[PDB]
RNA sequence: AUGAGCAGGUUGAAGGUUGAGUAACAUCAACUGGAGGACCGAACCGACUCUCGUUGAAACGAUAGCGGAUGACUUGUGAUU
RNA sequence: UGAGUAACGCUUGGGAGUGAGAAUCUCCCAAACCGAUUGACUAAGGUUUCCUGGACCAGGGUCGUCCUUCCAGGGUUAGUCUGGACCUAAGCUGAGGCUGAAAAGCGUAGGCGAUGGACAACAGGUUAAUAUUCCUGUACUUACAGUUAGACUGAUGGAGUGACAAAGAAGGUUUUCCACCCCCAUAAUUGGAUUUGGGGAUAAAUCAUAAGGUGGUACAAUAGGCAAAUCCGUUGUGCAUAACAUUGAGUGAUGAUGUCGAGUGAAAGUAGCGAAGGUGGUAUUAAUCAUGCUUUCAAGAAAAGCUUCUAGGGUUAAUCUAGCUGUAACCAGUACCGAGAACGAACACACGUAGUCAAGGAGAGGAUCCUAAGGUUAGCGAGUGAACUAUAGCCAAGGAACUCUGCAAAUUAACCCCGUAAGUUAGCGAGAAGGGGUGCUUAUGUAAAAGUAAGCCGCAGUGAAGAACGAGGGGGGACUGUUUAACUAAAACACAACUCUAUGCCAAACCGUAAGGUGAUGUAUAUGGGGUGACACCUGCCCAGUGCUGGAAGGU
């Protein structure tokens, strides 16, 4: 009786945090295409 | 002390309740870009008198205007409450 | 020496045995030292990248590898006295505490026939032949017991250093080197006659008669229970596949990989080391 | 069905009737439903008939049909009853109370009825 | 890698100590002993039949019980495949 | 449309008031409830849902004058606590460098990364919110610069320590509990009353005592610990009574001229007021001693950090101790919900999830009923007692005849007293099987009591709650065990073991292409791969073909 989503801000900071997010160029091309697609939300810091 | 951190004092219900007592706990709103020591000595420099004790918190950014077509966010600002020796009171 | 284990349980019995731990071993309550103990890490059957490389590994408790003078040439020509014989869970045999006279300690692997309080000398010169001594291979008469021999010049003994292991001497070669030695498990080769070795046979003859008794003890040793090859699907395993308790139906089956393992020797013969071998557990060369 | 409300069970009904007769003895006027008033009328008439003698034994049984409120105590209630109210209705045979049905409750259009009492 | 915890009632093994006893044994007797992929039995882990129900409270629950319940222990925090 | 339709998402009634308008808003009285929770602390999380006043557009299973709903205002305080300024474990990044079409990967020096080590403040107080955080009392701690008083300190390197498993038992300590006593309220009117019920606390910190606990202690040097050593260590001499080094509950004084304390008490049960504020114990309990000791093997973290030796240096002193004085102690954090009316929940979905406190009586238990403090009416109600559904209470007799079916469903379990067969690989079987009885009162009881005798009641005394239905035989599997999310829980898998093969170090094999690594920080008594899979006896035949190996002559 526990779904697959478990919220925890610190583990999020390590997982989808920008400073950890500079691990591969794939992330930069993906966020570049996101910017080209005008996504106002690009990071967890800007929810 | 850059003379740009101490913005204004505040006056609220709990502020009035604490000031009618002898706590001498003057309250101010500032930029959170200064430490407790930094804010206390900044107050000292801008007034020429050293404070007794300073406590600091922040006004947590909360949604403003509630539920509407254009919701917003409350500003972030450090609330600093200072104590003074009972013998003196400052003029604002 | 082993002793049968009284199961004392209400669910069947157990066919396991246990080492004496009382007469051949002292201070069962583990009170070891600090300097030369470093935690022997277990990879859990994985490489340095985290991918799968080994099967059925894991389940052991924490064990500390003992920094042991394997080269046995770090300090020589100094007399020492055996202080104790301590169990080594990290290796087949058991370690031993000896004390150098200069003010330094020492942990070696000890053979059988040694007790607490015996005088042992380590040197690069012809010294006592009784087991445990470390002495170069240029001064031993043939037909003797010796173990823990290295092949590199000052490489450290790493061969036949398990419990109940040794080697034999079968003459030299007409090159000033390549002394003929009967290797363990029936092999025979030629190694350097100037290397180091630990004479005698290794102790703890018990491992040939040790029965785990239960699956859980096997997990606790490290070898986790694993699935047979025939138990998988045909897409995963060659033996696996087909339903109805189907046995193997092909000649000389392969591994889970494309490798055929029965009847074939897995080694390269083009090395000059191959030409330096005497026997292969069957006959000459 | 499975787990649900206890509903109308005899224990709940008897506790409710006892509480309501306690309330009507306390205040003198109670507004209930007719489907409860009908059997509470018999229950209260039997209570009145049971202890008009005003003896110690009568108090012994009637201590088992009274409850407490926020205005008086059960001891005060029984004392006042036995003193003057209980033997009041010994003149006419029955008919000590009337249930006059008022307007329905606003909540679910359920009937309301007030209870009054005189000889 | 680092840890939390597995109530209570328990049962009372070898080892050993001693004595009788034997030439040595052996055998027996009294005792400490708290071990058992040991028991009942919890919190707990998970579900073996039927049942409610299957536009259900339910994209799998609940109950009548159920196997385990000191060990092939349940599980956490962070990481890996 | 079906349709005014199934349900109305696990639970009351009354009085009074507000409001024009009341089951739904408020205050209170009961009831039955969670109560090893319907309690509290509470990691973590969502983040204003937290609080006051106004109101109910939208959401709330009718409604909602209300909601945790919206509007306006208000709300989170840290030298001592949690996460930084100290540190690292797995693991991660990674100067360079290596490998590698680029790309990228490896990984060195390094640097990050608590669920941890060292590590300085407790109680009381009020509020509409919190307050190891604001106030009072009581304290302590670190560097800082001067200071006098004492002294040569000793690190960058080395060493000791830090630094550690699991399980079991009994000892010391306050405790819990019991009776007594003191204090507090306290004489009942419905038969007898010649009362019942409650309470009896004080700490941080300082000083002394420290019950007790652990492990050599004093002397001389050495060939080891890049250098060196007085430090560690080695060998010697003295004593092994414990000298010795060492920690330590709790105890006594402050602390404590105080708070507090049930209760008493002005329109709030609030200011104020406030009595006592102890004795002996334990054959029950928890924790300090306790990184204690012993036992078993599965052999049981590092770094930081304290002591610390020489190094290094110091000298009109480096360094450092004590005392005094002054300065100051920065970062995020503090609301509630918090195994959930605030998390997951697609939801105000009857559900479940870190750790901690954890009542009493009956019982060993925290198994089960009841209630303690606290908290509660699970945001549709009212009816009547048709069929049928869901659950139960009852059923006699036949008593498994039903059906493939003892699927489903009823005695049975607690207490003690007896007693228990075959087989056995001597473990078990066995709580076998199969039975006796269990209440109260009087006396006696022992350390409490079991237990015994006398008497009595009922139809019967785990009186309601919680407690197993067996024997005989077969097939497989020995067994304790893993199971296909959620159609199916095992004779399948696993398994100890048996067996064969391969592997002698740049080991065989494995990951990529590759450095390199697992293998393995292994060393043939080890590992890998193939077959079977308690125990015992064995596993007979043919290498026909095929396969695998060896091979030397020789045709290709």
JSON list of N, CA and C in Angstrom, two decimals, chain C residues 98-132:
[
{"chain": "C", "resi": 98, "resn": "UNK", "atom": "N", "xyz": [54.37, -14.50, 15.20]},
{"chain": "C", "resi": 98, "resn": "UNK", "atom": "CA", "xyz": [55.77, -14.67, 15.57]},
{"chain": "C", "resi": 98, "resn": "UNK", "atom": "C", "xyz": [56.32, -13.28, 15.88]},
{"chain": "C", "resi": 99, "resn": "UNK", "atom": "N", "xyz": [57.34, -13.23, 16.73]},
{"chain": "C", "resi": 99, "resn": "UNK", "atom": "CA", "xyz": [57.89, -11.95, 17.18]},
{"chain": "C", "resi": 99, "resn": "UNK", "atom": "C", "xyz": [59.38, -11.91, 16.85]},
{"chain": "C", "resi": 100, "resn": "UNK", "atom": "N", "xyz": [59.77, -10.95, 16.02]},
{"chain": "C", "resi": 100, "resn": "UNK", "atom": "CA", "xyz": [61.18, -10.72, 15.75]},
{"chain": "C", "resi": 100, "resn": "UNK", "atom": "C", "xyz": [61.86, -10.16, 16.99]},
{"chain": "C", "resi": 101, "resn": "UNK", "atom": "N", "xyz": [63.16, -10.40, 17.11]},
{"chain": "C", "resi": 101, "resn": "UNK", "atom": "CA", "xyz": [63.91, -9.94, 18.28]},
{"chain": "C", "resi": 101, "resn": "UNK", "atom": "C", "xyz": [64.26, -8.47, 18.22]},
{"chain": "C", "resi": 102, "resn": "UNK", "atom": "N", "xyz": [64.15, -7.82, 17.05]},
{"chain": "C", "resi": 102, "resn": "UNK", "atom": "CA", "xyz": [64.51, -6.41, 16.94]},
{"chain": "C", "resi": 102, "resn": "UNK", "atom": "C", "xyz": [63.46, -5.49, 17.54]},
{"chain": "C", "resi": 103, "resn": "UNK", "atom": "N", "xyz": [62.25, -6.00, 17.78]},
{"chain": "C", "resi": 103, "resn": "UNK", "atom": "CA", "xyz": [61.17, -5.16, 18.28]},
{"chain": "C", "resi": 103, "resn": "UNK", "atom": "C", "xyz": [60.07, -5.01, 17.25]},
{"chain": "C", "resi": 104, "resn": "UNK", "atom": "N", "xyz": [59.93, -6.00, 16.38]},
{"chain": "C", "resi": 104, "resn": "UNK", "atom": "CA", "xyz": [58.94, -5.97, 15.32]},
{"chain": "C", "resi": 104, "resn": "UNK", "atom": "C", "xyz": [58.15, -7.27, 15.35]},
{"chain": "C", "resi": 105, "resn": "UNK", "atom": "N", "xyz": [56.88, -7.20, 14.97]},
{"chain": "C", "resi": 105, "resn": "UNK", "atom": "CA", "xyz": [56.01, -8.37, 14.99]},
{"chain": "C", "resi": 105, "resn": "UNK", "atom": "C", "xyz": [56.04, -9.02, 13.61]},
{"chain": "C", "resi": 106, "resn": "UNK", "atom": "N", "xyz": [55.39, -10.17, 13.46]},
{"chain": "C", "resi": 106, "resn": "UNK", "atom": "CA", "xyz": [55.34, -10.84, 12.16]},
{"chain": "C", "resi": 106, "resn": "UNK", "atom": "C", "xyz": [54.16, -11.80, 12.13]},
{"chain": "C", "resi": 107, "resn": "UNK", "atom": "N", "xyz": [53.47, -11.83, 10.99]},
{"chain": "C", "resi": 107, "resn": "UNK", "atom": "CA", "xyz": [52.37, -12.75, 10.75]},
{"chain": "C", "resi": 107, "resn": "UNK", "atom": "C", "xyz": [52.72, -13.57, 9.52]},
{"chain": "C", "resi": 108, "resn": "UNK", "atom": "N", "xyz": [52.87, -14.88, 9.71]},
{"chain": "C", "resi": 108, "resn": "UNK", "atom": "CA", "xyz": [53.21, -15.77, 8.59]},
{"chain": "C", "resi": 108, "resn": "UNK", "atom": "C", "xyz": [52.09, -16.80, 8.44]},
{"chain": "C", "resi": 109, "resn": "UNK", "atom": "N", "xyz": [52.18, -17.65, 7.43]},
{"chain": "C", "resi": 109, "resn": "UNK", "atom": "CA", "xyz": [51.33, -18.83, 7.31]},
{"chain": "C", "resi": 109, "resn": "UNK", "atom": "C", "xyz": [52.13, -20.03, 7.78]},
{"chain": "C", "resi": 110, "resn": "UNK", "atom": "N", "xyz": [51.60, -20.76, 8.74]},
{"chain": "C", "resi": 110, "resn": "UNK", "atom": "CA", "xyz": [52.43, -21.78, 9.36]},
{"chain": "C", "resi": 110, "resn": "UNK", "atom": "C", "xyz": [52.06, -23.18, 8.88]},
{"chain": "C", "resi": 111, "resn": "UNK", "atom": "N", "xyz": [53.04, -24.06, 8.74]},
{"chain": "C", "resi": 111, "resn": "UNK", "atom": "CA", "xyz": [52.75, -25.45, 8.36]},
{"chain": "C", "resi": 111, "resn": "UNK", "atom": "C", "xyz": [52.34, -26.29, 9.56]},
{"chain": "C", "resi": 112, "resn": "UNK", "atom": "N", "xyz": [52.17, -27.59, 9.36]},
{"chain": "C", "resi": 112, "resn": "UNK", "atom": "CA", "xyz": [51.83, -28.50, 10.45]},
{"chain": "C", "resi": 112, "resn": "UNK", "atom": "C", "xyz": [53.08, -28.90, 11.21]},
{"chain": "C", "resi": 113, "resn": "UNK", "atom": "N", "xyz": [52.90, -29.28, 12.47]},
{"chain": "C", "resi": 113, "resn": "UNK", "atom": "CA", "xyz": [54.01, -29.66, 13.33]},
{"chain": "C", "resi": 113, "resn": "UNK", "atom": "C", "xyz": [54.57, -28.54, 14.18]},
{"chain": "C", "resi": 114, "resn": "UNK", "atom": "N", "xyz": [53.97, -27.35, 14.17]},
{"chain": "C", "resi": 114, "resn": "UNK", "atom": "CA", "xyz": [54.47, -26.21, 14.93]},
{"chain": "C", "resi": 114, "resn": "UNK", "atom": "C", "xyz": [53.50, -25.94, 16.07]},
{"chain": "C", "resi": 115, "resn": "UNK", "atom": "N", "xyz": [54.06, -25.64, 17.24]},
{"chain": "C", "resi": 115, "resn": "UNK", "atom": "CA", "xyz": [53.29, -25.30, 18.42]},
{"chain": "C", "resi": 115, "resn": "UNK", "atom": "C", "xyz": [53.67, -23.90, 18.89]},
{"chain": "C", "resi": 116, "resn": "UNK", "atom": "N", "xyz": [53.13, -23.51, 20.04]},
{"chain": "C", "resi": 116, "resn": "UNK", "atom": "CA", "xyz": [53.38, -22.20, 20.62]},
{"chain": "C", "resi": 116, "resn": "UNK", "atom": "C", "xyz": [54.70, -22.23, 21.38]},
{"chain": "C", "resi": 117, "resn": "UNK", "atom": "N", "xyz": [55.58, -21.29, 21.05]},
{"chain": "C", "resi": 117, "resn": "UNK", "atom": "CA", "xyz": [56.84, -21.15, 21.74]},
{"chain": "C", "resi": 117, "resn": "UNK", "atom": "C", "xyz": [58.03, -21.84, 21.12]},
{"chain": "C", "resi": 118, "resn": "UNK", "atom": "N", "xyz": [58.18, -21.78, 19.80]},
{"chain": "C", "resi": 118, "resn": "UNK", "atom": "CA", "xyz": [59.29, -22.42, 19.10]},
{"chain": "C", "resi": 118, "resn": "UNK", "atom": "C", "xyz": [60.14, -21.37, 18.40]},
{"chain": "C", "resi": 119, "resn": "UNK", "atom": "N", "xyz": [61.44, -21.65, 18.31]},
{"chain": "C", "resi": 119, "resn": "UNK", "atom": "CA", "xyz": [62.39, -20.70, 17.76]},
{"chain": "C", "resi": 119, "resn": "UNK", "atom": "C", "xyz": [62.48, -20.87, 16.25]},
{"chain": "C", "resi": 120, "resn": "UNK", "atom": "N", "xyz": [62.28, -19.78, 15.51]},
{"chain": "C", "resi": 120, "resn": "UNK", "atom": "CA", "xyz": [62.28, -19.81, 14.05]},
{"chain": "C", "resi": 120, "resn": "UNK", "atom": "C", "xyz": [63.19, -18.70, 13.53]},
{"chain": "C", "resi": 121, "resn": "UNK", "atom": "N", "xyz": [64.03, -19.03, 12.55]},
{"chain": "C", "resi": 121, "resn": "UNK", "atom": "CA", "xyz": [64.97, -18.10, 11.95]},
{"chain": "C", "resi": 121, "resn": "UNK", "atom": "C", "xyz": [64.61, -17.84, 10.50]},
{"chain": "C", "resi": 122, "resn": "UNK", "atom": "N", "xyz": [64.67, -16.58, 10.09]},
{"chain": "C", "resi": 122, "resn": "UNK", "atom": "CA", "xyz": [64.49, -16.18, 8.70]},
{"chain": "C", "resi": 122, "resn": "UNK", "atom": "C", "xyz": [65.80, -15.59, 8.18]},
{"chain": "C", "resi": 123, "resn": "UNK", "atom": "N", "xyz": [66.30, -16.14, 7.07]},
{"chain": "C", "resi": 123, "resn": "UNK", "atom": "CA", "xyz": [67.59, -15.72, 6.55]},
{"chain": "C", "resi": 123, "resn": "UNK", "atom": "C", "xyz": [67.69, -16.09, 5.08]},
{"chain": "C", "resi": 124, "resn": "UNK", "atom": "N", "xyz": [68.66, -15.46, 4.41]},
{"chain": "C", "resi": 124, "resn": "UNK", "atom": "CA", "xyz": [69.02, -15.77, 3.03]},
{"chain": "C", "resi": 124, "resn": "UNK", "atom": "C", "xyz": [70.16, -16.77, 2.94]},
{"chain": "C", "resi": 125, "resn": "UNK", "atom": "N", "xyz": [70.35, -17.58, 3.99]},
{"chain": "C", "resi": 125, "resn": "UNK", "atom": "CA", "xyz": [71.47, -18.51, 4.05]},
{"chain": "C", "resi": 125, "resn": "UNK", "atom": "C", "xyz": [70.96, -19.89, 4.44]},
{"chain": "C", "resi": 126, "resn": "UNK", "atom": "N", "xyz": [71.71, -20.97, 4.14]},
{"chain": "C", "resi": 126, "resn": "UNK", "atom": "CA", "xyz": [71.26, -22.31, 4.52]},
{"chain": "C", "resi": 126, "resn": "UNK", "atom": "C", "xyz": [70.98, -22.44, 6.01]},
{"chain": "C", "resi": 127, "resn": "UNK", "atom": "N", "xyz": [69.71, -22.63, 6.36]},
{"chain": "C", "resi": 127, "resn": "UNK", "atom": "CA", "xyz": [69.26, -22.70, 7.74]},
{"chain": "C", "resi": 127, "resn": "UNK", "atom": "C", "xyz": [68.40, -23.94, 7.92]},
{"chain": "C", "resi": 128, "resn": "UNK", "atom": "N", "xyz": [67.76, -24.07, 9.09]},
{"chain": "C", "resi": 128, "resn": "UNK", "atom": "CA", "xyz": [67.04, -25.28, 9.45]},
{"chain": "C", "resi": 128, "resn": "UNK", "atom": "C", "xyz": [66.00, -25.64, 8.39]},
{"chain": "C", "resi": 129, "resn": "UNK", "atom": "N", "xyz": [65.92, -26.94, 8.07]},
{"chain": "C", "resi": 129, "resn": "UNK", "atom": "CA", "xyz": [65.02, -27.43, 7.02]},
{"chain": "C", "resi": 129, "resn": "UNK", "atom": "C", "xyz": [63.63, -27.75, 7.55]},
{"chain": "C", "resi": 130, "resn": "UNK", "atom": "N", "xyz": [63.44, -27.76, 8.86]},
{"chain": "C", "resi": 130, "resn": "UNK", "atom": "CA", "xyz": [62.14, -28.12, 9.40]},
{"chain": "C", "resi": 130, "resn": "UNK", "atom": "C", "xyz": [61.08, -27.12, 8.94]},
{"chain": "C", "resi": 131, "resn": "UNK", "atom": "N", "xyz": [59.83, -27.55, 8.79]},
{"chain": "C", "resi": 131, "resn": "UNK", "atom": "CA", "xyz": [58.83, -26.72, 8.10]},
{"chain": "C", "resi": 131, "resn": "UNK", "atom": "C", "xyz": [58.60, -25.37, 8.77]},
{"chain": "C", "resi": 132, "resn": "UNK", "atom": "N", "xyz": [58.30, -24.36, 7.95]},
{"chain": "C", "resi": 132, "resn": "UNK", "atom": "CA", "xyz": [58.08, -23.00, 8.39]},
{"chain": "C", "resi": 132, "resn": "UNK", "atom": "C", "xyz": [59.22, -22.06, 8.07]}
]
